[PDB]
Ligand binder design. Structure first.
Ligand SMILES: *[C@@H]1O[C@H](CO)[C@@H](O)[C@H](O)[C@H]1NC(C)=O
Lengths: 24, 50
């Protein structure tokens, strides 16, 4: 069987707190 | 061999790489803490970040 990945598999780049911020 | 001579001989190499990062510190200098101030202007050091 098969299916679309949708938006799975995002992960944290580093052990740094950040908040209320857009970053890339 | 001892008969190799200077440039020819074996030499031991250490490379100390470091994970120098803002992530969790675990290996640090011959270094010792103060008390923690709150609500007053201070110089500060955490893990040798300052
Ligand atoms: C996913 O790929 C397979 C072949 O690798 C295909 O048969 C299947 O229809 C695809 N499914 C989707 C959701 O595109």
């Amino acid at each position: 069987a098969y299916t679309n990945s949708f938006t799975r598999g995002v992960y944290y780049p580093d052990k740094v707190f950040r908040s209320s911020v857009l970053h890339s | 061999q001892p008969t190799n001579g200077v440039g020819y001989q074996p030499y031991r190499v250490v490379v100390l790489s470091f994970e120098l990062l803002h992530a969790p510190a675990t290996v640090c200098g011959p270094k010792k803490s103060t008390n923690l101030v709150k609500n007053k202007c201070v110089n500060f050091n955490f893990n040798g970040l300052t």
